[PDB]
Paper text:
In this study, we identify a family of complement inhibitors from the hard tick Rhipicephalus pulchellus, hereafter termed CirpA (Complement inhibitor from R. pulchellus of the alternative pathway). Functional and structural characterisation reveals that members of the CirpA family directly bind to properdin, inhibiting its ability to promote complement activation, and leading to potent inhibition of the complement response in a species specific manner. Whilst many molecules act to control inappropriate activation, Properdin is the only known positive regulator of the human complement system. All CirpA structures share a lipocalin fold with a short N-terminal α-helix followed by an eight-stranded beta-barrel and a longer C-terminal α-helix.
Using this strategy, we were able to purify CirpA1, A3, A4, and A5 and determine their structure using X-ray crystallography to a resolution of 2.0, 2.1, 1.8, and 1.9 Å respectively. Overall, the structures appear very similar, with the biggest conformational differences in the tilt angle of the C-terminal helix H2 as well as variations in loops between beta strands 4 and 5 (L4-5) and between strands 7 and 8 (L7-8). We identified three regions with high conformational variability between homologs. All these regions are part of the observed binding interface between CirpA1 and properdin, and hence the conformational differences might render other homologs incompatible with binding human properdin. Another CirpA1 residue undergoing a conformational rearrangement upon properdin binding is Y122 which forms a hydrophobic pocket around properdin P377 together with CirpA1 residues F122, Y131, and F150. This pocket is incomplete in all three CirpA1 homolog structures. However, it is likely that the homologues have evolved to target properdin from other species, especially given the identification of multiple CirpA homologues in a single tick species.
Author numbering: 29, 45 to 59, 59a, 60 to 114, 114a, 115 to 203
């Protein structure tokens, strides 16, 4: 089995397009969850992460310091260590990215008060109104994962999202 390429998360998040959460295994679902990148250096990205509660937008300014997921020296930056999130997310890592980064599968690690909470999201550049144009290879990587961990997923997005 040929080794999959590492998926650079700095290239995935380097866009002015909104990156919407299209699928998630998160239990406490944030409706209309999305990211808007604002600035990026070689060591960190700066982005606005938002979601809606009762149709009202809640925003946070987050910082992600690039790193390699396996802590390999000089490895590909497929991971960000996150500061500024009041929900406790401290790391995300890009498990798959489509060509031109139109879609990505992102694992999330958070800390509540007791232990690390882990889930996974399928993220799409621009509004995923036409699901038939979202890369099926991206969907299948997410499907393969939810089959392995035996979990169901929901979609935080609908047209109503601001």
């Amino acid at each position: 089995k040929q080794e999959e390429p590492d998926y650079p998360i700095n290239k995935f998040m380097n866009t002015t397009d909104e990156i919407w959460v299209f699928r998630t295994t998160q239990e406490n679902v944030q409706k209309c969850k999305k990211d808007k990148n604002k600035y990026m250096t070689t060591s960190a990205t700066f982005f606005t992460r938002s979601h809606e509660e009762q149709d009202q937008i809640h925003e946070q300014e987050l910082v992600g310091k690039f790193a390699n997921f396996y802590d390999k020296p000089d490895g590909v930056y497929d991971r960000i260590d996150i500061t500024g999130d009041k929900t406790g997310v401290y790391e995300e890592a890009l498990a798959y990215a489509s060509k031109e980064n139109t879609c990505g599968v992102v694992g999330v690690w958070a800390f509540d008060g007791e232990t690390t909470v882990v889930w996974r999201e399928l993220r799409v550049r621009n509004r995923p109104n036409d699901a038939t144009k979202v890369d099926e290879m991206c969907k299948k990587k997410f499907d393969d994962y939810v089959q392995v961990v035996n979990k169901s997923w929901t979609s935080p997005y609908n047209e109503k999202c601001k």
